[PDB]
Ligand binder design. Sequence first.
Ligand SMILES: [Mg+2]
Ligand SMILES: [Mg+2]
Ligand SMILES: [Mg+2]
Ligand SMILES: [Mg+2]
Ligand SMILES: [Mg+2]
Ligand SMILES: [Mg+2]
Ligand SMILES: [Mg+2]
Ligand SMILES: [Mg+2]
Ligand SMILES: [Mg+2]
Ligand SMILES: [Mg+2]
Ligand SMILES: [Mg+2]
Ligand SMILES: [Mg+2]
Ligand SMILES: [Mg+2]
Ligand SMILES: [Mg+2]
Ligand SMILES: [Mg+2]
Ligand SMILES: [Mg+2]
Ligand SMILES: [Mg+2]
Ligand SMILES: [Mg+2]
Ligand SMILES: [Mg+2]
Ligand SMILES: [Mg+2]
Ligand SMILES: [Mg+2]
Ligand SMILES: [Mg+2]
Ligand SMILES: [Mg+2]
Ligand SMILES: [Mg+2]
Ligand SMILES: [Mg+2]
Ligand SMILES: [Mg+2]
Ligand SMILES: [Mg+2]
Lengths: 121, 233, 196, 84, 101, 154
Amino acid sequence: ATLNQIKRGSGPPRRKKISTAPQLDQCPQRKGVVLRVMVLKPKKPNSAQRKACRVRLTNGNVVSAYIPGEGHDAQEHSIVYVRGGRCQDLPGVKYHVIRGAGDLSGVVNRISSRSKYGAKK
Amino acid sequence: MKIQTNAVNVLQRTSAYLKSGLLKETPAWYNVVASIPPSTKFTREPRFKNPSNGHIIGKLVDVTEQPHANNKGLYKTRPNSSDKRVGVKRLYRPPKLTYVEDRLRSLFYKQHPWELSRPKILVENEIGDENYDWSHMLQIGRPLDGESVIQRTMYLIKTKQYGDMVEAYDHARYEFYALRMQEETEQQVALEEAEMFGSLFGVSAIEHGIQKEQEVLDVWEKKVVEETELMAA
Amino acid sequence: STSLWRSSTQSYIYGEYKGIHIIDLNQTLSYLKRAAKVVEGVSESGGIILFLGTRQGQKRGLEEAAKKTHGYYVSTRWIPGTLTNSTEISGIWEKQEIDSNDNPTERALSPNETSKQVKPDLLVVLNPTENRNALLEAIKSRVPTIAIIDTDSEPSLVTYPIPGNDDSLRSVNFLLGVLARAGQRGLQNRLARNNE
Amino acid sequence: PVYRLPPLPRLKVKKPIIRQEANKCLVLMSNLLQCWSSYGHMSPKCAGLVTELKSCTSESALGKSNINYHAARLYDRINGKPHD
Amino acid sequence: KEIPRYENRTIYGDIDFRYHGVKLHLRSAKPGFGLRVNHVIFEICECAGIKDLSGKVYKSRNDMNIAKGTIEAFTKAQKTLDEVALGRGKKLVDVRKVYYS
Amino acid sequence: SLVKLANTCAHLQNCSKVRVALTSIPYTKLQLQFAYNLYQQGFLSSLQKGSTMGPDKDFVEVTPDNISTRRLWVGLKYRDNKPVLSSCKLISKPNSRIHLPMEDMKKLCSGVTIRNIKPLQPGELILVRAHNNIMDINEAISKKLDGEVLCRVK
RNA sequence: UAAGAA
RNA sequence: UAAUGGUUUAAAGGAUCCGUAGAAUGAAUUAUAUAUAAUUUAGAGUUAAUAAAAUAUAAUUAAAGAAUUAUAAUAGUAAAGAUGAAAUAAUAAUAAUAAUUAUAAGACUAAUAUAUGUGAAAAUAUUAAUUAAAUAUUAACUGACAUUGAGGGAUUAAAACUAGAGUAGCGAAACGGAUUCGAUACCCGUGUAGUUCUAGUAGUAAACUAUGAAUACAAUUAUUUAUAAUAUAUAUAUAAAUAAUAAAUGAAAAUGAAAGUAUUCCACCUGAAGAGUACGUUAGCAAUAAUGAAACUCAAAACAAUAGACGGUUACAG
RNA sequence: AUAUGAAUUAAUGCGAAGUUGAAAUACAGUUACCGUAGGGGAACCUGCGGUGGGCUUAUAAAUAUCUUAAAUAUUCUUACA
Ligand SMILES: [Mg+2]
Ligand SMILES: [Mg+2]
Ligand SMILES: [Mg+2]
Ligand SMILES: [Mg+2]
Ligand SMILES: [Mg+2]
Ligand SMILES: [Mg+2]
Ligand SMILES: [Mg+2]
Ligand SMILES: [Mg+2]
Ligand SMILES: [Mg+2]
Ligand SMILES: [Mg+2]
Ligand SMILES: [Mg+2]
Ligand SMILES: [Mg+2]
Ligand SMILES: [Mg+2]
Ligand SMILES: [Mg+2]
Ligand SMILES: [Mg+2]
Ligand SMILES: [Mg+2]
Ligand SMILES: [Mg+2]
Ligand SMILES: [Mg+2]
Ligand SMILES: [Mg+2]
Ligand SMILES: [Mg+2]
Ligand SMILES: [Mg+2]
Ligand SMILES: [Mg+2]
Ligand SMILES: [Mg+2]
Ligand SMILES: [Mg+2]
Ligand SMILES: [Mg+2]
Ligand SMILES: [Mg+2]
Ligand SMILES: [Mg+2]
């Protein structure tokens, strides 16, 4: 609070924006291999059977990635691409798989938001 | 309480209302208040003299102005700790009004406790109407009481007919006795002369006191008997 | 008493004597003349003057001040909201049209006219310490006010203070009679020019 | 010593004590019974008491404080609270 | 109320006013400068006739307290040039007002 | 002494809050120059030499015999239910002394925040010390004189 | 030339 | 995209003081270029005198008092003790308990009393002595010698430990008796460690005013408290403390001469949880003390106040 | 020195529906909490000091007086003096 204390290092804490996807190592996405496909239960009050998968990335980190879209064709040893973005109601799942990239096909018969689901016109 | 702003600025707020058009008609007081502004300072004001005795407030005597040894034989060569303390509070404290007469009013009634039994009226008639010459004690429009003695004493002092307040006070005392003896003889002789011509009075002071004592004592008897009977049981 | 001093009244005080504060009567006289001139000016302008005093034996002086100023008075109790809530309190009582000479015209008023607020042009309070509600309402309703300010009273709560004793009926009646006579002179001047 | 109090929510006596005047009948009865205990039953030495008892109990066998009001009325005036 | 305004478009100087938990920092602005302030203050300025104003709100940003405290800031924490001049017995001249005659 | 000047600034604010018409400040060259600048600028109604007890009615000559009991008595101004001297603050603090050249002083007088100092306000007086002379900032600009920016008074 | 929001 | 912040209660004053560095801050007048020099006494000190119980605080040494427990007797008799009510492997016919004496031992300190006060804090109130410290005002003297204070130093409740003494009462643990559905608890009985003293170690407490120190200043009232007068009376002046406040501040509760107005220096805080945890290091006989992370998870979490509901919550009435 | 695996191993976080005690919040039914020690798997229980962030929530042993009471005060409208 005093001037000599501010000189010695006192000041406002930095508004430091922590990385929410540390396992990508500051990459837009990483290629990975799915170790298994899981069906998890969201936190309450939400109720569903959420589609996820464990994926080992090329940098060696193993993460849990949500599989978006109505239906997916992910299976053990599938090559996937993983970007940031958590699944809010699944604790521990902090990544998303990219539909339409790698061995994961785009959503079938998607009409709206096709680019978010790897679907052609 | 915070110094209020909105009682003394009613004109300014009213004029804002009038200029904006929120108020159509000017009030009847508006021009009057505009021509007679309120006082809006509300400051504390220092004072530099006691009104009653003329003592100056806010003067410090310097060591140069005390070149002579004090009662203990010591010269004053530097300021003491009282002189070094800021005495601004004394400038704002309402001064205690003092009069020598009050010391001399206390003495009289210590020497004449039965002069306190003479009823006094504190309701003033008109202080401006008083034109007294205190060369004598009796005054038209005044009673004879301790204040006559004390005003005569002060008169004798201010004319230097006596140098010491004690002697002037004693002179006034003896004049006061001279007048009181005359008054009491007048009263007694008036009553005697009245009785000698067939004045028939009813209850006197003694009979008044007797009757009041009887009124009280009847109730006292009743209470005593009731309490004794209750105690016996 | 010096033990009940409100120090914001410091500049009005002459000294202390016998355990009480003495009010500087030169200042009292100056403030009293100013307030009397305000009363006279308001009565001369045909404004409404209200005399408020709620202590025991003040009714006679208040009534006489009102009657010789063609004014109004209250001595029983100040209903809180009498100014700021005038519709709910004073809206039912009757009102009257009068000419320049204060002669009743006996005209029929509309219900809308009867329902309007009729705010005093001047409020004079004899005991402002026990009448804070009236002072605050006058401030909100923007009514200039005169009051007798004793050693324990807040001076800034009134437009035109008069330093003086508010506890003695003689002192209060003296000041009130002075103000009432000033109002009477203003009224007489108004009638004089309206008769010329 | 003077012990001034802080500003109180009230000034009230919990159970104000009152002037319970004793019944004359019971006092007369006690005196008469004492007389009978000392001077014997149906003694003539206090027939007067008997008479008085008979006269006082004849029609009926048995023959509030305001402090809180005044305390509540006056508390604000006398409490010596400093000005607002 | 009546709000003092310099040239009927802005506030006279700068205001650093605390109203309960709200710290207001208002700054007068040049002609043509907009109302670059908190939205509550913007609405109050639109109603009051303030056209040019810059400012920032710190600590509490409660809308009700901002609204109420900005009005005490305008009425209590402002002194017009006339008030200052008469209080100090000095002449306060606006240099831009005199540059253009 | 900036500590004593800060004490005087705070004391003036305190005396304006309660609306005392007359108060005292320490008797020093800096204090006297500051009070004189306030008096000439219209913030004070009167400036007198005096003692710890009050202002001097007649001239009293200051010597080491009475130096410890000298004070400077200042009269405060009020108008329209507002103090003329509301705020009085130091710019150059004892632990951060701010010395500006004439160009930065002109920038400060023209609305620029220099060294975190808020610029001069419409009715404000900023005092500057140069060669042990206190003086108005605009006067220092006119005389082309760099100096220590000392205090604001509004 | 310093605006905040959920 | 908020420090144009905070730390009584939301995160945050160091247990306390002493004091080193400070590239921290700090009186007055004059002269010469922020310094040097000469002057000054307002801060800070020294020594006397005077007044006062400087009584209280610290160490040391020497004493007193009521009671408790046990032992022995005396007479006397059948129960005693405890509990809500009972029962207890060790109350009593081996004469108990109660009473009256007499011996012994430890520990404690009733009233005064308010911790008023004293002490840096921790602490400290049965008595006396020795030594040491602490008050106010005057006189003289020094001439800024000051403030604060990183690191450092010292002291530091209760518990705990190491030795040696002591051990009457109380009493962790343990063993029993109850209660209970259950008792691992509250209650009852024996009762070890500890509580006591001597020499140490350790350096933590809600070590609290949950509030660092210093300086300048700001409106009142009432009490005391301590001096200084003046003749119990001046409802006597000048100080400190306490109580209620104005203003001011504040999220408010509230603070109130500081939580106000300012200045200086230091300590500390930056969502909850993980966590005062792990690891490392230092110290210690140990217990531990200090220093003190991160990953993971979440959009929480907290403070003041408001209105209810509730309470094995109070009082008054009917 | 530093990184990487590691059998085994200590802690801790989260989630679904549940499960068990009655420790805290009211006098929470044994005042809570801080420090420390012992016991207990643990919640907790017990000992010693400290704090209020619990008791300031504080609210009677009660009795009162004498001067012209009216042909006089109470009336009074800028009057008189
Ligand atoms: Mg979509
Ligand atoms: Mg009064
Ligand atoms: Mg910034
Ligand atoms: Mg807490
Ligand atoms: Mg906290
Ligand atoms: Mg502390
Ligand atoms: Mg702490
Ligand atoms: Mg004792
Ligand atoms: Mg130190
Ligand atoms: Mg203890
Ligand atoms: Mg021990
Ligand atoms: Mg041992
Ligand atoms: Mg033992
Ligand atoms: Mg036991
Ligand atoms: Mg239990
Ligand atoms: Mg036990
Ligand atoms: Mg040690
Ligand atoms: Mg610990
Ligand atoms: Mg600690
Ligand atoms: Mg705060
Ligand atoms: Mg540890
Ligand atoms: Mg429980
Ligand atoms: Mg409990
Ligand atoms: Mg156990
Ligand atoms: Mg303690
Ligand atoms: Mg409780
Ligand atoms: Mg409480």
